[PDB]
C-alpha cells in the first residue's frame, strides 16, 4: 500500500527543496576507511588534553561505601532531627501514630463471654431485614420500619439480646439510621388521620394489623411468581401481636449517641497486641471489606451504617454520603460511641480482604533467606519486627509518595555493589514528603538498611542483596490508579510544554493552510538543530541540549557506507492532491493522554484512522530494515536468549558490565533527524521512488499538530478570571489571554510521538551504538558488545579492558569520559542511574549474579492479589491459573500458591456461587506445573474426589489407547459413541473389550451445570473495587437463561432440588460440591434434571484428550538442613489425530483444550527448588 501514493497529484512547491538542501549542506558521506581514524584520534587527543587540565567536568565517581551510607542517612536532614534511632522507641510510637493504627493494636473487647457465643445464632430481626430488603428490590417505608421494630421487640422479650441498635437509633432497611420517637409520632398521626377519614366502629389496634396482613399478602403473592418459596427465609409469623399499636407506642430505649468529628480521647489501651502473631491482619481485612462494601448504597432519590464483628464483639462503621469518592468515616460501638474518625478513600483497600495467611507466609519465607549468617544471629528478632511494620504500614496508608520512596531504593542498592557511578545520583533519590507517616516510613527503612548492610558483616552478600532488592518491590502492593484526575492532566501538559520553550519554537495556530512565517520558522529551526559544536571551540561541549553535529553525522554516514560496521556474514472522502505539508484534506492531528504506571506517568498520543493507516508504512519499512541486521531485541525472540546467555557467561567469568538507561528519549528525538540520516545512505549500489515516498511521509510527520486538552484550558481560564479581578506554563496562557485569542493547538520541530515511531528509533540506536563501539575499539585495544531495546542497553567488556581497569585506572576513566561525550554528541543522553561493575548485570528488569538467582517474589504475589474482574466465573480461574503457572517457573514455592488459590476460592464463595470441581485444584505440587498442564491438574482433582471408581476406567482407557495407536478401530468409535447417550454407552464400550464394565453404583455421581441451555448474562469498570461490587451484584439478579425463553434465579433452582427427597449433596474439605443422583428418579422428572452431568464421562473424555496431547504416562498408576537457596533447572516433557481432537472437544462443555494453544504461550524452561523435587508423584508408562 506504500506505492498507492502514485495515484495522487503532485503539488510540491519550492518549500520541499530547502529542507533537502539543508540536510545536504555540509555533510560528507563519501569518506574512506582510512580518513576517519585520523579524525577520531585528533578528537581523542584534544579531548584528553583538555580534560587533564580541568576545563571539562568528570560526571563519574568511584564507589565508596562509607560515603554512600553517610549520604543516604541524612538525606532529609531538615525535618528529621535525629541521626540514629532506637528500635524500642520506634515500636513504641508505631502503635500510636494514627486512628487506624490505634484501632489495630488496642485492647478491644477485653471480656469475651456468652455475649460472644450468642453472635452465631440468628435472631428474627435479621430474617425480617433480609426479607424486606429482597422485597424492596422489585406509606411504604413506614410499614417496613414498624415490622422491623416489632421483630426487634419480640426478639428482646424472649432471651434478652440487643444486636441491631446504636444508642436510641436502629438500622432498619437500606442501611438507614432512622430515629425511634419520630416513627412513633408518625404512626400515631397516620393511624389517627386514617381513622378520621374512614369514620365519616374499629379501633387503632386493628387497622395496623389489617395493613400488615394486606402488605404481607401482596408481598408473598409477588414473590411466589418468580419461583422462590417462603420456607427459605425461616421467618416466624408470631412477631405480630393482637395489641401492636399500644405495644409500639410505649417502648423505651436509652444509650450513647453516635457522632462524626469533621476536624487522649481513645477509650482503650494502646499497645496490647504483639507483632509476632497474626491478630492485626485479620482486623485490617474486616475493616477493608467494610470500606469496600460501603459503595453499594443507592442514591435514595441522613446516616448510613455497616457492621462487622472482630472477636465476637460488634462494631459499626457510619458515614454520611453515598457514591464513590473520599468521605469521612466514624467507628462506633454500642457500649461507647465515637471510637475514632478518619478520612479514607473507599477504593485502594482491595488487596487485603481475605489474604491474611499469604502475607504472613511471605514475610516468613523472606526472612528465612538471611538465617545462616553469624554476624546477624543476635539481632535477628528486630528484622522481623521491621519487615512486618513496613508491610502493615504500606497496606494501611496507601499513598502515592510512599510508592516512589520505596521504588527509589533499587538504584541505591544497585550502586552500592558497583565500581563507578554517576555523580548526580543522590539528588535523584529525593522525593517531596508531606504527612507525618511518610517520615516514619523513611525512618523504618533507614533503620533496616543500616542494620542489614553493616560494616562488620562480610559472610553472604548474595542473600542480603536479594533481601534488600525484595523490600524495594513492595510498592507494587499499593495501586496504579490515580488519586486525582485533574492534576495529572496538568502535569502531563507541563511535561509536554517545558522543553519546547527553551529551544525557542512554538506555533500557536497552524490554520491548516500554512503562511510564510511558519515555513520560514521551520527552515530556520531545521538549520539551528544541526549547528552543535564541541571540544574544538572556546567554551566546549554544552551538555544536555538537543542537536547533532555535522562532523559526527559525516563520520557515521561514511562508516556505514564503507562497510566497517558489518559483521563477517553480513557482507555476503479520498484526497487527490498532496503538498509538502500534508494531503489535500488537512494535516495530521493528534490528541494527548496519559497512562498509569507504578511510580510516575507516561504520555500517550492518539490519532484518527487515516494517520494510523499512513504510519504503518514507515513502521513496516524500518522494522524490515532492522530485521535485515542483527543485534536488536525489541521484536526479535532469539536475540533475547542470546543476550541472556552472554550475560550469564560474562557474570560467570567476572568481567566488567555496563548497565545503561537513556533519559528524555521521546521528547528529544525528531523526524528531521531520521530524514537527514536516511538521505545520506547508499543501500544497493524504482527504489529511489520508494525513498521519495518515505521522505514525503516523514515531511508530513514533521508538520503535525497536537490538540490541547479541555479541562486544562477551562481551569486556566477560571484561574485567570479569578486572580485578575504562576510558572512558565502559566505565563503562556496568561499572555495569550491578555491579548484575546486562546491556545488550542501546538506545533513544533522538537518532538516525536511517544510510542508512535518506535522501530525507526530502534534502528537509529542500533547503528549509532555500532559506530560508537567501533570508535572505542579503534582507540584502545579492546572490544565491546551491545544489545538495545530502543531505550535500554547492556554492554559486556573483554579481558583487555578488565585488566586495564586495575592496571591503569586513569586511562579507564578517560575512556568512560570519551564514551559519554561521544554519545552526547549524537543526541543520546546517559541517565544518572547507569552503573559499571563486576558483581551484577541487568537488562529489561532481569538480574543475574554468580552463585544464586534473583527471583522477584513480592512482585508476583502483588500481581496475583488484585487481578479480578467482572467476568464469567469460569474465565477468572484460567487467568489465575496462568499467572500462578508463570510465577512458579521463577522460584516461588508451591505452598505459597496454594494459599492464593484458596484466597480466590474464598472470594468466590463470599458472593454465593456454587463451586464445581472444574475451577481450581489447591493441592498441587511441582510435577503438576513442570510436566503437566491444566487438564492434568483437573484430572488429579477428580481422582482425589472419587477413588475406587477411576481404576477400571483407567484400565479400559489403557486398552483403548493400545488399540487405537495402530488403527484397529478409528471409525467404529468416533461415530456411534460421541453422538449417543452418555450413560448407556460406557457399559457396552467396556464390554467390547475384555474388561469388567463400570458398576451401577458408580454412575450416580453427577455435578450441577448452570448455563446448560445458554450462557449466563453478565452485561446488562475503571477500578477493581467496582469490578468486585458489580460481580457481587450481577450474580443474584437473574444471571440465568431458561429452556424456552425466560430468566431465573440461583435460589429457585436449589429450592427445586431440595423439593426432591432422592438426591444427595457431598462437600469435600476445601468446599467442592458433587451430587449423587439415582437412575430411577432420573426419569419422570424432566424439568430440573436437565442441568446435571455425569462425572465419569467427562473424566474419560478429558483423560483421553490429555493422553493424546501429552505422552502416554498419564494413563499409568500414581504412587507416592535443606537450605532455602538450592535451585535446579528443568525442562518440560516434549493430520490423523486432529480430527479426533476437534471431535472430542465440542462434546464436553467443561474446558477448551484447543484455545490454550491460540491465546496462550508455553513456558520455555523452569527453575525450581531442589528440596521440593524430592516429595512428588511419579507416573510410569
Ligand atoms: Mg537498563
Ligand atoms: Zn438473640
Numbering used by the authors: 199 to 336, 344 to 405, 410 to 472, 477 to 514, 533 to 803, 1102 to 1214, 1219 to 1258, 1266 to 1560, ...
Task: Cite, word for word, the article reporting this structure.
The large (L) protein of LASV is a multi-domain molecular machine that binds the conserved 3′ and 5′ ends (the ‘promoter’) of each of the two viral RNA (vRNA) genome segments (denoted L and S) and plays a central role in the viral life cycle, which is entirely cytoplasmic. The L protein contains an RNA-dependent RNA polymerase (RdRp) activity and catalyses both viral transcription and genome replication. Transcription is initiated using a capped primer derived from host mRNA by a yet to be elucidated ‘cap-snatching’ mechanism involving the intrinsic endonuclease (EN) of the L protein and possibly its cap-binding domain (CBD).
From grids of the apo-state, two different 3D classes were separated. In the second class, denoted APO-RIBBON, at 3.73 Å resolution, the EN is not resolved, but residues 822–1110 of the L protein form an extended structure including an α-bundle (α-ribbon, 843–884, with a third helix 907–925 packing against it) that is not visible in the APO-ENDO structure. Masked refinement of the common regions of the two apo-structures yielded a map of the APO-CORE with an improved resolution of 3.14 Å that allowed a more accurate model to be built.
